[PDB]
Each structure stands twice: as C-alpha cells, then as structure tokens.
Amino acid sequence: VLVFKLTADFREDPDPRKVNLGVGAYRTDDCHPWVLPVVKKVEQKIANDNSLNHEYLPILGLAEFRSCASRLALGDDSPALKEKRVGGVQSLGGAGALRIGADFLARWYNGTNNKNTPVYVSSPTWENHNAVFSAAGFKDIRSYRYWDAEKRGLDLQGFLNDLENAPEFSIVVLHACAHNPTGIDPTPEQWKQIASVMKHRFLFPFFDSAYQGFSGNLERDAWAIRYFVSEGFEFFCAQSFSKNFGLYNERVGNLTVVGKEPESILQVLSQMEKIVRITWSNPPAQGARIVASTLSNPELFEEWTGNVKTMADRILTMRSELRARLEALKTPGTWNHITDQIGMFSFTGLNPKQVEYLHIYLLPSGRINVSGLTTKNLDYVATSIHEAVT
Numbered sequence: 001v002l003v004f005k006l007t008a009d010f011r012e013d014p015d016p017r018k019v020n021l022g023v024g025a026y027r028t029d030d031c032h033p034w035v036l037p038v039v040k041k042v043e044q045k046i047a048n049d050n051s052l053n054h055e056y057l058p059i060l061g062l063a064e065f066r067s068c069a070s071r072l073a074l075g076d077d078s079p080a081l082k083e084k085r086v087g088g089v090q091s092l093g094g095a096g097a098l099r100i101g102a103d104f105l106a107r108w109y110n111g112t113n114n115k116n117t118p119v120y121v122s123s124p125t126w127e128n129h130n131a132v133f134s135a136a137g138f139k140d141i142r143s144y145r146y147w148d149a150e151k152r153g154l155d156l157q158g159f160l161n162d163l164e165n166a167p168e169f170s171i172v173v174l175h176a177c178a179h180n181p182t183g184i185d186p187t188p189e190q191w192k193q194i195a196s197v198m199k200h201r202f203l204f205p206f207f208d209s210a211y212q213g214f215s216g217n218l219e220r221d222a223w224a225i226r227y228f229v230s231e232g233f234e235f236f237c238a239q240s241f242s243k244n245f246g247l248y249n250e251r252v253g254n255l256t257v258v259g260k261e262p263e264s265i266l267q268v269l270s271q272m273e274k275i276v277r278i279t280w281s282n283p284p285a286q287g288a289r290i291v292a293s294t295l296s297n298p299e300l301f302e303e304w305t306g307n308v309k310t311m312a313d314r315i316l317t318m319r320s321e322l323r324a325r326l327e328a329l330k331t332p333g334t335w336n337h338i339t340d341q342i343g344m345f346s347f348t349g350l351n352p353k354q355v356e357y358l359h360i361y362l363l364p365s366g367r368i369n370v371s372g373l374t375t376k377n378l379d380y381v382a383t384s385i386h387e388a389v390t
C-alpha cells in the first residue's frame, strides 16, 4: 500500500520543507501534476463530439484502443500482428491487465486451475506484483536475483542461474523497461541471454510495460518485447498508459496477448470475457477514447511523442544535476549509478534509519521519484547532501 499512504504523509511538515519522492507520477520543475497538451486537446474533441453515446463498451473494450495499444508495444510491422496471432483486452491500468492475466493463468495455464505453478518476480520488484498474483490464487511466488547491492546494478549471472533452476513452464514477470524500483534494465545483449534460458526451459514471459516512453523513445523502450516476438515466444504484456499519457485516474491499460496461431487468441480472448464479466463487467471509456484518438491520428501521434520526450528529458536533467554534483562535493564514496539508472525511479543506497530521518523520501529501501527533484525543490535534495550520509 505504502506509496498511496506516503501520499497522505505529504503533509507531515517539520520545516514546511516536506517532499513527496513517493508517488509514481510525473511532476514538473514547479512540483505540479502535468496534464499533457495532446490530452487537453483530445478531451475537447471528445466533449465537442455529440455523436458519442455512453452505451456499454464490449467486455474486452474499445476496438480502436485495443488495436492501437497492442500496435504501440509490438510495432506497426510486427510478424505477430501480420499473422493475426495477437489479441488485446482493455484493462483498468497495468494493475488491471496484470490481475486479468494472473486470473487467466490461474484458470487456464499449465493445465487447469493450476495455482501450484511457480511465479517469478525480480528481487526486488514492484510492491504490487506479489499481491496481484496471490489474489489470483498462486501459492508459490519466488524471487529471481536482480539487484546486486554491492555492484549497485544487474546481477545477470544470478538472474540467469535462477531462470536455469526454475521448473519448466514457470511464470516469469519481466519489467519491459524502466525497472521499478531500482531503475536498471537489461541491455538488449542481456535480454538475448535471458530469452535463451527461457526458451530452453519453456518459461512463460509475462511482461509488465507500465512506462513505455520513459529512453524517451517508444521504439527503443519496446525492443525487449519485440525481440521475444521475433524469437517466436508466446507471452502476455500488461500495458499501462498512466505515466506515458498522464491518465493515472482514468485507469487506462491493456493486456496484449501473443500466441502461436490465431485460433489460440480466439480461445484465449473468449475465456478472458468471463473473467472481465465477474471483475468489472466492462471497461471505462474516457481513458481508452483519449488514447485511441491520439495514436490513430498521425498529427496528434507525433505531438504526443514530443510530450513523452519532454518528460523523459527533464528526468535526465534532474539525474545529471545531482550525480555530477558528486564530483566536487563528497562525503561517502561518490558514485555514478544515479545517472546510470533509467526510468522514473532511482535506487539511492541508503539504510532503513537514514530513511526514517529523511529529506522525507520515506521509501525504506531508498527508492526516490527522480521527477520529484526540482531546482527550487533544491537540486540539493539532501540539502548539504551528506549530513544524513556523512
């Protein structure tokens, strides 16, 4: 729960020098929420289109949105799409997609009603992964080594070794990019090895793809996904558009499915309808509409890629102006990994008692929202910087 209850703590002011480095939402240099221009544009288009009703969308969701979302992840020229072996199920954000997928694997994968199948999540991972799959009824939820605290980066040989020792068919939850919370992603060459182990041992890739856009480049961010496609994997991918469209509170996501033949997608999609029918009946519209219109229209599309760049660039800027500021000033070590990490979230270094004092970025692990730094919010986050570090 933590992050949506460090949202309540943002108020507990010692010197009215609080800090939310807590919630995962982009914040401008003036520490405000940023509605994208493309969005404020498209919203008007909707509100000025009197042809639109509010009749029930299909269970699986808006057609146009489902196409555009899957196409964004797999690429316009994907062999999957061209061989009509790709489905998509509008969801209530990435959390919606994940749950729906979790529920489906629990009911239809590795045999029937198989809750014994091992589920694998990065060590560490997003606080909500363990819970989502527990809810879907999986009993065995396991770690794969990922964050090497010592080398402050990817433990590739531990990861691979763990995938090597996973029972055949085990499910594997992968961060498509912008690993949360640590901010280290595999290189393509690192992906190529992981895929190899997963291919030999028939492991199931379940991608989590909540921050497509945040190298700043959407095609770049989707390379891992698109490689697994080209290597002939079957997989799910939980897409969220909460960050890359700023539609947090319209709950816009999509569970893309990749199969070996069209008939699989048909079987699979039809069984998803039952799950949706007893979870939320059918999805909300405003979200999906805003996205569907943006991606389907070349004019708006281009402008949107700009707006994601904008956010992506400010995050790098705030990264530089605090690492590089550890070249002149020092106290313990120095260290590259702030500007090494990518995504929205940094893994700093800290212990649990620094975090208690600190200023207040209270994610015990030491994870901060980089977007939550500003010049005014003092690029000097730790103020002098190493008084709570020294």
Ligand SMILES: Cc1ncc(COP(=O)(O)O)c(C=O)c1O
Residues within 6 Å of the ligand: 024, 092, 093, 094, 095, 096, 126, 175, 180, 208, 209, 210, 240, 241, 242, 243, 248, 251, 252, 253
């Ligand atoms: C990997 C990952 N997936 C999904 C989400 C949640 O997005 P939403 O609430 O729109 O599903 C987050 C939030 O930080 C995340 O880090």
